[PDB]
Design a protein around this ligand. Structure first.
Ligand SMILES: C[C@H](SCCO)C(=O)Nc1cccc(Cl)c1
Ligand SMILES: C[C@H](SCCO)C(=O)Nc1cccc(Cl)c1
Ligand SMILES: C[C@H](SCCO)C(=O)Nc1cccc(Cl)c1
Lengths: 237, 300
């Protein structure tokens, strides 16, 4: 059934699985009309589909044209996500298709279930974890490719850079979730932490800076401080 | 006016005949039910005094043969039997009537309840659901599972209702996934009405038959089937106007007849609120909505 703290280690076993997050598929700015009414203008979005064991990120970019003339976009977005995940699965060789797909919001279950009826053996599951994948657009290189897209496009990343050379996927995921939680709680502080040292750069083929093992420990400490910090500034504790 | 003769009543039992029920004591001198209206299917049903577990009974049509009930002390139930010797049959019934040993099917002349509950239930169509070809009547009980329940275990003793499953390739056209899931008109009108049932009369008959097995036997798979057939219509944006109007009449008499004290178990809150307040047909079932609101507002 659902995914939570009790079965957390299942993410790093050898059954292929994908997280799907649809938070950033349908994105708008809200603004005033000349008549003083309110209207939205959509902006490009993305589906965040992640293999937590390998770090492979299938970033499907949702170009604003996909909404033209459509109604009920928030509902449509869940079905468009499902359509694109189903298309991704069908494009993968059989030995690469996932045995499970975990959605980060329960409203994706029925759309994805329906789009995957052809794959009765792929388990579609919710989770009780409050994962911070919404913050993916706070990673500059992901935000950049999304905003620059002039047409639908799939881009592939390893969201763990080269981390798996030195640490396990459990640790790699833990780091990623801590970074994304910080970016979600205070993006400016988080980025200042990441980027206040010019001696540590982001390689052209990477998303995050080239921290040594010790620097990552320092960085992780600062991110936990910030999350507690803002949790005080928020709750006055 | 036809008759169902009982050889006797050796065990204390509550006897149902359509929407009526009466008590017979153990070894009471009882020889059956007379004045049964010709032209309708009927159901005769049983609940033993000593074990209200297992309601059971028989769907029959008097035009299809002469039928009698005989208790079987080995299998422990009232069985329906066909008597092929028509003379011997009329002879025994006439003796039982002369001695006034039969209760009277007590139809009030104003009353169209049974007609309205059974308008599209045929006996040959009932046999398509309850498979036992050597008899002209069909046995049902509380515990019989449906062919769909057995997909999720004796196939001989199952109720073969039409399988309805909203998250199935049958229900969903490739390339129309959101369309067909959010508006089930394709599944209703093309898959079910045109390709399985052939007409809405047939669609209503199975729905009527699932309701009555739910109500008279507490048969859970039947209740599931009744609610699924309602929900398929209510969830379709495009339904013939005459099917909606008839559906409203059908459900009205079902809700009217339901025992007040069983509404908590026989009525699915989610389906009914969806159908009356959220679905495409939320404005189309005026009679059903009025009786539901005045009779079971707690379910809503
Ligand atoms: C076959 C047995 S013959 C046993 C008496 O000869 C039977 O009971 N027939 C039947 C016909 C009409 C009414 C009833 Cl209640 C029964
Ligand atoms: C008590 C309910 S209502 C009474 C008739 O409307 C009932 O069915 N009574 C009944 C009594 C004896 C024989 C039969 Cl067939 C019915
Ligand atoms: C098509 C199905 S046969 C079952 C498997 O699909 C059918 O005829 N149902 C039906 C129609 C009228 C009355 C009754 Cl009781 C059932």
């Amino acid at each position: 059934g659902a995914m939570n703290s009790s079965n957390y280690a299942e993410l790093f076993n050898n059954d292929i699985k994908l997280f799907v997050d649809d938070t950033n598929v349908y994105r708008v700015t809200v603004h005033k009309t000349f008549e003083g009414n309110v209207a939205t203008k959509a902006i490009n979005g993305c589906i965040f589909t992640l293999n937590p064991k390998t770090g492979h990120l299938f970033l499907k970019i949702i170009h604003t044209s996909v909404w033209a003339g459509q109604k009920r976009l928030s509902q449509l977005a869940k079905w468009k996500t499902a359509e694109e995940v189903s298309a991704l699965v069908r494009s993968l060789p059989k030995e690469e298709q996932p045995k499970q797909i975990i959605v980060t919001r329960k409203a994706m279950l029925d759309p994805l279930e329906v789009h995957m009826l052809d794959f009765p053996n792929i388990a579609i599951r919710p989770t009780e974890l409050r994962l911070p994948f919404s913050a993916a657009m706070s990673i500059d290189k992901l935000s950049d490719v999304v905003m620059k897209a002039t047409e639908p496009q799939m881009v592939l990343f390893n969201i763990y850079d080269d981390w798996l050379d030195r640490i396990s996927s459990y640790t790699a995921f833990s780091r990623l979730t801590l970074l994304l939680r910080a970016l979600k709680t205070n993006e400016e502080s988080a980025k200042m932490i990441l980027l206040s040292d010019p001696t540590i750069t982001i390689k052209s083929y990477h998303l995050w800076p080239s921290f040594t093992d010790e620097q990552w420990i320092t960085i992780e400490s600062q991110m936990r401080d910030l999350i507690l910090t803002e949790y005080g500034r928020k709750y006055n504790v | 006016m036809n008759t169902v003769p009982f050889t006797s009543a050796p065990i204390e039992v509550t006897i149902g005949i359509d929407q009526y029920s009466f008590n017979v004591k153990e070894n009471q001198p009882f020889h059956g039910i007379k004045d049964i209206p010709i032209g309708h299917v009927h159901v005769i049903h049983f609940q033993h005094a000593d074990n209200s577990s297992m309601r059971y009974g028989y769907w029959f049509d008097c035009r299809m043969g002469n039928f009698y009930i005989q208790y079987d002390p080995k299998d422990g139930l009232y069985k329906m039997m066909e008597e092929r010797d028509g003379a011997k049959f009329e002879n025994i019934v006439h003796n039982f009537k002369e001695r006034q040993m039969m209760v009277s099917y007590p139809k009030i002349d104003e009353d169209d309840t049974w007609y309205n509950l059974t308008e599209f239930v045929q006996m040959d169509k009932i046999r398509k659901i309850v498979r036992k070809d050597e008899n002209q009547f069909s046995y049902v009980d509380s515990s019989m599972t449906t062919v769909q329940e057995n997909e999720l275990s004796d196939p001989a003793h199952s109720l073969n209702y039409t399988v309805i499953n909203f998250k199935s390739r049958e229900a969903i056209r490739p390339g129309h996934e959101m369309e067909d899931f959010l508006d089930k008109s394709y599944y209703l009108n093309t898959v079910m009405l045109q390709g399985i049932f052939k007409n809405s009369s047939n669609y209503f008959g199975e729905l009527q038959f699932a309701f009555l097995n739910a109500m008279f036997f507490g048969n859970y798979g039947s209740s599931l089937q009744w609610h699924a057939m309602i929900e398929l219509i209510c969830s379709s944006a495009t339904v013939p106007k005459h099917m909606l109007d008839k559906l409203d009449e059908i459900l009205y008499y079902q809700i009217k007849t339901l025992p007040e004290q069983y509404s908590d178990i026989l009525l699915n809150e989610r389906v009914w609120n969806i159908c009356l307040y959220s679905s495409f047909q939320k404005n189309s079932l005026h009679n059903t909505e009025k009786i539901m609101e005045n009779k079971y507002p707690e379910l809503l």
